[PDB]
Design a protein around this ligand. Sequence first.
Ligand SMILES: Cc1cc2nc3c(=O)[nH]c(=O)nc-3n(C[C@H](O)[C@H](O)[C@H](O)COP(=O)(O)OP(=O)(O)OC[C@H]3O[C@@H](n4cnc5c(N)ncnc54)[C@H](O)[C@@H]3O)c2cc1C
Ligand code: PCD
Ligand code: SF4
Ligand code: FES
Ligand code: FES
Ligand code: FES
Ligand code: FES
Lengths: 48, 48, 761, 48, 161, 157, 323
Amino acid sequence: NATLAEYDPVRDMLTLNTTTQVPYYVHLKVAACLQMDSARIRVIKPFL
Amino acid sequence: GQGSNTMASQVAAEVLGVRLSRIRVISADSALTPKDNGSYSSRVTFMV
Amino acid sequence: GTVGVRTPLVDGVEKVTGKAKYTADIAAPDALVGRILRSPHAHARILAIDTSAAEALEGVIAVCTGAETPVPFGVLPIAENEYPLARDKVRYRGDPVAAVAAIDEVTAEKALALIKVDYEVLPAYMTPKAAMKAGAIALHDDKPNNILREVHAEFGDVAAAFAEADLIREKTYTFAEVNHVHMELNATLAEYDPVRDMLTLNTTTQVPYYVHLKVAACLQMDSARIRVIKPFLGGGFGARTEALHFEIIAGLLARKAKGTVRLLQTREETFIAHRGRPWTEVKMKIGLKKDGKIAALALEATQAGGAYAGYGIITILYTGALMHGLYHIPAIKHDAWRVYTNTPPCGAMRGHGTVDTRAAFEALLTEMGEELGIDSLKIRQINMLPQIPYVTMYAQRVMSYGVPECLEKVKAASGWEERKGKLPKGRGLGIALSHFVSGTSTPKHWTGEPHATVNLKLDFDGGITLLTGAADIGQGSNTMASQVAAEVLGVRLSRIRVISADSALTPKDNGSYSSRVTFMVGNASISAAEELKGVLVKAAAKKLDAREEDIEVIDEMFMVSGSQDPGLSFQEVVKAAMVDSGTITVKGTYTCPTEFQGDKKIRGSAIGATMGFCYAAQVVEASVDEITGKVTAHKVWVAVDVGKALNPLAVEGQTQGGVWMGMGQALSEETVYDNGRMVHGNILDYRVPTIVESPDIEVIIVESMDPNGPFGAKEASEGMLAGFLPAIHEAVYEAVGVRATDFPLSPDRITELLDAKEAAA
Amino acid sequence: FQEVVKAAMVDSGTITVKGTYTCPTEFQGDKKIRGSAIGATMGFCYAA
Amino acid sequence: MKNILRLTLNGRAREDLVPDNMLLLDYLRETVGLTGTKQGCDGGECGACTVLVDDRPRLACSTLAHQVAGKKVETVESLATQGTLSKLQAAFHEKLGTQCGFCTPGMIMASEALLRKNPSPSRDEIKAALAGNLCRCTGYVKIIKSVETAAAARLCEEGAR
Amino acid sequence: MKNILRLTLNGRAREDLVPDNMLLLDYLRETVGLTGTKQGCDGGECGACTVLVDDRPRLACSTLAHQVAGKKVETVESLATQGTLSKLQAAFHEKLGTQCGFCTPGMIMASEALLRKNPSPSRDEIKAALAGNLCRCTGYVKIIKSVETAAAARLCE
Amino acid sequence: MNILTDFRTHRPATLADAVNALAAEATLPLGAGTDLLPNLRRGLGHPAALVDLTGIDGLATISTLADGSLRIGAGATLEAIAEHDAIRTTWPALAQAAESVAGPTHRAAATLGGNLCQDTRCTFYNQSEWWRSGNGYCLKYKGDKCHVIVKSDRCYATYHGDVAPALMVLDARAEIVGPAGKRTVPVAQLFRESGAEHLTLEKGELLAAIEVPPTGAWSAAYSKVRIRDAVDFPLAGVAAALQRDGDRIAGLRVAITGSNSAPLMVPVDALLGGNWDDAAAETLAQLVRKTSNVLRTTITGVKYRRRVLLAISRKVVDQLWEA
Ligand SMILES: Cc1cc2nc3c(=O)[nH]c(=O)nc-3n(C[C@H](O)[C@H](O)[C@H](O)COP(=O)(O)OP(=O)(O)OC[C@H]3O[C@@H](n4cnc5c(N)ncnc54)[C@H](O)[C@@H]3O)c2cc1C
Ligand code: PCD
Ligand code: SF4
Ligand code: FES
Ligand code: FES
Ligand code: FES
Ligand code: FES
């Protein structure tokens, strides 16, 4: 398991590359758990 | 690893009558690809 | 709102942190080093070529020659005469003859030396007059007299118009050839996948679409097997608005090596690629009335165009096309010759083809107005287009014109009235007007496609992705497109992620040339945002139980017009809009109306035809040291009609850059060849101005509000370059009393003028 | 295919299409049975 | 031949086997992989490769990597604090002292050296410090404004401003 | 402490200052940047980090980088010729001896070492050589087919 | 990666160590490399080794001697020299010349020794390996013909160093160290008017320091001409030192650069005792013209370079006289 998280403080945007089969769910839970608007989050599943 | 990128290419090429090689699949990047519910319960081949 | 707001470019953060990856910064561990064997002769036939010793060198993976590149290329479909690698003959020193891909630089360098080439040296011609001499060997067989294209046109009765003039003068002006000197060196990273026979390129281009076409045609590879990506680009200013040989060679080598090849270029090789502004001789003849009104104009322009066609035909047409649309001129005669020479091919450079004739026209008008006792700023005000709209004799349709305000603005800002003609000994003030198109309204390739296409995507997350094939080359197109789409949607700039110039993902765009991007991609972007806004308004209306016409979008809120209730947040509307829909994808397009594409019965009138012009008026204050002859530009006051400044911060920077590149051509830049050999191949002897002598430049924005531009906008990057030359020319005359006729006005030319004026009188 | 693509670009430019799929309500279990959505599917893979 | 090179780069100790003939520019771009430092010319003419060596500007393309042994070297990648821009970087971005962005790393490093040595430079002093840094996009006007804005933002309150 | 390490890696001479306590796995993935070699466990249990040292298989996660001084080291990145797959790689791809692909680099390196030492391995010999390499996707069936196909293709080269 | 020969880079801690390293073949001294590296990158030289002098302790020290003389180690940077308060108040021409060199970034590391010993320049020489091999190289390096003066009796590449002329009118001395030992010569003698052997340093020799004597009744200045206001080498450079008695020229020293294969003193005794007037200025101009030998080794023309050389010679003496 692994997650690469890139937070851009200038723009307050977050980009994740993570070991998931469900990037949509990760997108939802990261937004809700960080109380961060989903439009500021980008989730990418690279090779898994 | 199950082959959904191949599966999607195959069925789309079949309908279009083109060769597999004419299709470039871009997948699982929220800024570019349409949301998918996830690779669980073997829903991918059937629905996607 | 986002439009009209001073906005840092959306990709600025990556530039100041060094995170922006330009072509040469892209990691590719498996990359072979590519190198090109260039011709040491200016003109010669290739008799034989032997690559066997190079091919046998350990570490050499591939070696190619012209035998493998049987298809020529040219930016214009009607004139493709350049081969990626030379076949039969070379036509300038630097002309590519062979190329190699090796494991490292030292090996690639050894490989080049091992290639044996037998040449039959031919006579080389440096000037138009020499290349045109009877008996001169033809660079290209289809043009026996080395004249690529001649233009001969007349508008109105010129002879009659001149007979009606009270004062007629003519003068000849010469302009050195200049180079773009974009700071990033040319480079291409070519990745060939032999398992699938696919090629992917990252390259230093302003026109990834053209590269896509030329690589497919030149390698005889289906375009569907090629992917072109423009990463961050370190400028271009015209240099990269044509597919360049090293990009094609990189792909050729990658395929031959069955792998990846990184082809870097030195600064000298970047100067060799050239495609800059041609050396130009301009004969200017102007007829005026005693009151200052223009009666007639006759001009001749000869350009030394280098060794291959390229943009030549278009460039030579431009020498006359923009003699129209600025001043009302009763009759115009235009003669011009584009001549092949054994030097690097010339091409498009900021203000493409209109700079030199514009400078010549402005200088003469000013000189004549002095003989008539009319103030140089006044004589321009006197000749402005009488009414708007104005259809020029060239068939251009001017629907917006801010020249009146531009002149009044720079007149006031520079304190022209109280200072012109009343400055200390050695100082002067000059005025000039210039303008340029907001995109050539006719694509180079007639595919019947819209002139710009923008796609938008909006999914459950609420982030809007804007996909455009447009190339942001530092001018800000990624920001421009974001701004106009956000304005239409009533959202914040930050809600838009722009994905650009990657053929596998973004809609094709014709390229960042002729200042077509803001006008066309801005309109296309507006159009796409309207499509999306409509989808969202429908969902909001349904959820608010209101009529769609009643919905207003303000700061990401959808509400019923004039209601006391604030409404739905953007995210609630997105949620509603997803129902029965899922991911929303819309397409927006823009196409120039036929009426703005010139006159069909005037072949070539498409060049110079546009939706509208950016106009610029500038006053330059300079001083001259008579001991050294050096001219110093202290300040420039410049007012530019850009229709509507979408981003005033960018308009200012674009205008300063354009005026400054003109100052470089006016005072210190010039290429120099010695029997075919480049002498200026470095940035020490090719004098790009440093920050020390560079003038301060104050920008005044004028908004004539064009009826067809995005939010009323026109271009804002080329129309102001040309005016600096005549303006400082006038300032030098007031400062020391000499009239330069040759640019640049470097110290050597000024002291010669000072010595002659002192020999006489 | 390339000649058709060329023809298709006229008056159109880039083509982008959207395809979707949704399971009919009848395959989503029985509304009056608790949690019957779990186990409800469009079809089963069978193995011997 | 390769020999040991010890230095502090962007705040971190480095101890590498480096070719005696390696330019600092190539060591940075290829050995450490820091691509922010650019190559804009064939040698010493443009300043795109400017980095800091013990607080002073140095052309990485005209410096052998081995000549900076035991010194403190900084590239454009070291200026931000994690993802937060320094005042100098924010000013170049906000005032548009950067367009294509290619000359920017070098221009910002020369600006950083100036501001560390002369906290409140005059307009002529800014020009003099950036004299060897070529930019083709800006006409330089907004680069000068960017440096003045950065200087004020960093400048001390208890002194003349 | 760092000390000089000289070896041949994927056909190229390396001369680097490497920490005495650095594992070959980390030297490869972090110092040289070759990410093909994977880490699938906490120490010697899965073979995902298998690479070649003088033609023989070696677990990069349980080998100090300094122990391979002067040897010839090869990772999955070295098998192809520029972009053209080796017969063994083409076989894994074509026979589907690879699904998610995570165990593949290690599986292929162990297979390569087998095929260099025993050009025509029996099915039992293939299993014996790949005994320490764990795969969770394939059930191993097509991995064995892949190796048999590569062996035959390398014989009638 | 930028190609350079596979040379060894020696980093001596002392002059003796540097001198010993320079004994080997094809071994070159190295200062900050602002002149040498661009040259080596273009293929102008194929050294087996470079001897870095920037690591020699104390080689960059600047100090004022017992007798009020200035002592500058060869490793001192042009920036340190241009900013040194004592130099700026007492030997301003030196600070002026140093500051006029290249750009600020080059000056931050460029050394005094490297500036004086910089190579001569020519448009057939400062070009790439591809450009030069294509043209048959030339007499200065790998060929046998001079393309500027076809007679080819010698290389005519021009010396464009800015500091040399200033040190020359200030009567500075050059301290040289080599295998034979230490020796000192007037700075003007460090140069030879020959494009391809422009320095009088012998195998194994290094310029170790420069010493400038107290100025006494002399005032000096340096003036340089270039098209851009920074970076450019001098198209012409003139340094002058003056001693004024009432309204007569008691002492005059004039040195030129950017004009010959060496920076040179101009014989001006004919002006001693005279006044400084239009007639005298004209005699200077012609004296300067005679000594100068402006040739087309530059992209800029000879006519202009000669015209401003003469013009600024007047200008700089005039500036001194009217001070
Ligand atoms: C774009 C550009 C513009 C320039 N503009 C100018 C200018 O306007 N004026 C000017 O004068 N120069 C100019 N230069 C030249 C150079 O930058 C400066 O002359 C400078 O002072 C070089 O000193 P350095 O320490 O870098 O020497 P290096 O480059 O290290 O050495 C130059 C030469 O001196 C020899 N050398 C070095 N130190 C010693 C020593 N102690 N004893 C004996 N030999 C030694 C070297 O072997 C070599 O041949 C320019 C260079 C470039 C690339
Ligand atoms: N009204 C208006 C207009 C404009 N804008 C802005 O500005 C810009 C620009 O625009 P335009 O003008 O439209 O343009 P485009 O088309 O976009 O682009 C292109 C151009 O761009 C310019 N600029 C620049 N910048 C930089 N930085 N770089 C460059 O390179 C350049 N180049 C130049 C040129 S030369 Mo050609 O090519 O000769 O034809 S053409 C050209 C944009 O983006 C924005 O930011 C605004 O805002 N507004
Ligand atoms: S002056 Fe002559 S010999 Fe000297 S470098 Fe120039 S061409 Fe070569
Ligand atoms: S890359 Fe141009 S000075 Fe270093
Ligand atoms: S911002 Fe483009 S070269 Fe400076
Ligand atoms: S990572 Fe599992 S054995 Fe090495
Ligand atoms: S293919 Fe997935 S673990 Fe082996």
